[PDB]
Design a protein around this ligand. Sequence first.
Ligand SMILES: [Mn+2]
Ligand SMILES: [Mn+2]
Ligand SMILES: [Mn+2]
Ligand SMILES: [Mn+2]
Lengths: 208, 208, 207, 208
Amino acid sequence: SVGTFSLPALPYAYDALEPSISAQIMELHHSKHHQTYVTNLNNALKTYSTALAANDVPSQIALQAAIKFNGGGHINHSLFWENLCPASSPDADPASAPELTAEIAKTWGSLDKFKEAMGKALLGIQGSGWGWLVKEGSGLRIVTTKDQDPVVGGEVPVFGIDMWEHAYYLQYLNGKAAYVDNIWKVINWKTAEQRFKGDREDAFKILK
Amino acid sequence: SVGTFSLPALPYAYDALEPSISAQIMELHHSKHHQTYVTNLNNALKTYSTALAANDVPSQIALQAAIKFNGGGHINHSLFWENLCPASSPDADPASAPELTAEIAKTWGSLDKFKEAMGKALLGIQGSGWGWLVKEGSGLRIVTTKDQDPVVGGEVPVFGIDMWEHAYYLQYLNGKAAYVDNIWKVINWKTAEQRFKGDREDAFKILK
Amino acid sequence: SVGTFSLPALPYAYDALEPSISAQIMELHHSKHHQTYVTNLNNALKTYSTALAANDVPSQIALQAAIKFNGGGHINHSLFWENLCPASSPDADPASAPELTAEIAKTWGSLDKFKEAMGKALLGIQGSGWGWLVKEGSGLRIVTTKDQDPVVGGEVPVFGIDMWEHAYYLQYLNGKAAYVDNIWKVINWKTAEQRFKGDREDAFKIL
Amino acid sequence: SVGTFSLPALPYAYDALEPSISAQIMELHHSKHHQTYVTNLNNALKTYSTALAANDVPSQIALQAAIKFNGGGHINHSLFWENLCPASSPDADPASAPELTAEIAKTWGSLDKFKEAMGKALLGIQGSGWGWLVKEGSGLRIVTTKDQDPVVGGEVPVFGIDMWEHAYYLQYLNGKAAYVDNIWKVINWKTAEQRFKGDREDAFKILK
Ligand SMILES: [Mn+2]
Ligand SMILES: [Mn+2]
Ligand SMILES: [Mn+2]
Ligand SMILES: [Mn+2]
């Protein structure tokens, strides 16, 4: 039936990503922001099914923003929690992603240069948005999305980093550069390797 | 059933709007451009139906652009044919719309000053789009929409003028100012009066 | 000389808007966020000035995003500080704005109905942006702008409310509804009345 | 001094791209559309010079839409005329572009599959816009731009194809598929090769 999504539990405790991300942020981000996206996604999808069955095209178009914003919020945050892990986990080691790092090194020259390029794109976002490493065809690309827009159909998301102010402000204030510097310690490279090796449908399987 | 829209017949013959709009433009515009929007709207809606029942949010979001573009294309042209009529028809006399023209005069000063204001907005559209007279509450506003974006936000559309190049190029070449000057002769003020006196749902009944 | 905008001083101390807006937010909002928009605006205008003289149109177009983002950031925040004041100030009383409130009541029915309608627009902003009460001709309208986009040429801004998360998150966390409820206590209605009675050029004289 | 652009002459006669593009379109496209972009760009640049000297940031921002639209119009058409040539010319032979066609074949598999992917992107444009083959770093990409937006700062334009309806409507009516199929015969692969081997400013040297 339509609109039966639920907030996924995190793979770790709310304080497991410290000191990179504070427990307060993880709790607010998951139990408030992501929760709201889930509930509002379900509400909009059920109303949309009514508009679709009645062939009400004006209502359908008017509902697109709520589905894109809340649907994207659910897609993006679901992907986000999964490509994070405690800094002490072996999954935080890029040696967990040999195939991905090889393609990363082939594209940007080195892992450090990819990190520099992505950091630049993350800090360059005006307003709210996300930075993504994506697979397009067989090649890798850094892309940004505004607000909660999900990665555009055709690209395989490898990992994403949330640059909305609620992802860092309580801990880093306006210092988003320090936030980006610290989040590398908690990137789940095992997850990134698995997404790089699968296709679009495989990546979105966590939503199931 | 989902996605069973069909192209409505015009209220007049293809040459009935001459000399303001040529028979060739009317036939191509109706039987090709509008027909394509109808067909591609129906295709997108059937695909959407599958993704909605499967709770496939990435596909639902990816389908939004086709639904808005082709759905808006169907909405906009359906309204368009109805707010046109042969220049010799009594429906082309603005005296057919006493309440609307009085409110127009209250807002812009006179019918001529509104025509100049709407003309300016139409000629100012960069690229493809539409100009609309809309009712917001009890007041009137001139708005433009890009591409085939419809006036679906809550406003009641009173009449629209298509500024896509296919609406005039074969007859007026790049002279869109001459096209706008001549379309006033075939504006259906009887239709505009009914929309001005009705609500949002009445105006969209044309889609039935 | 090109690109000499500076950070305007606030009309009050950093803690003057408590309890509606904390001193910590005011100091960060003013001394870091707004200051950054000023500096990057000046940098963008200096580069643009040469690209304009060189008839280098690709550079001019490539610089537009920084000029709109940082220029709007400077415009919006400069307007913002001026239509805020301490809650006990006489300027926080809407009786300080007789002509504006009369037109507000004529348009929305009452001041409460207008506050709710603007609240709805503020809370509906997806992502970062601003809510504005503006004058177009003789009538009032509620509009929202994305990111730091300033109010569209032709409208006179009457007052604006910042809905960027940095404007409230340290104090209200995700509770933007409570932020909006409390910011009504520190709206400067004397400033709003003055903007309502002047034109677009008047409201932009503070820069 | 500011705003002294002029309409460049075509590299060939108005009928030189026939039969792919008619002389009627070439003359209107060049002497009316592109000419209007030049004139309106110069006016906007002069007005900006006034707003800049007055330290008027609101007017500067309000002027951006006219500078991007007319400045982009001038850039895109200037590049466009240069990457077209008579179909019987040796420059129309893709063998004139050995390094570029090798990178195309390495990226898309063959020239025919690249033409197929670009054709799909060109026909997929909603409203007015352009399709581009661009270079980013060492890689090739098909991108589209809306209205007269020029290619995003950072990419090197290799060649563009105008999908505004004024580019084909008089000759092909709504048949943009026939227009694209025929324009391949007049693509200047000598121009494309030179741009592929140069950088961003080299490609914009045509504006001098
Ligand atoms: Mn988030
Ligand atoms: Mn049309
Ligand atoms: Mn702010
Ligand atoms: Mn063109």
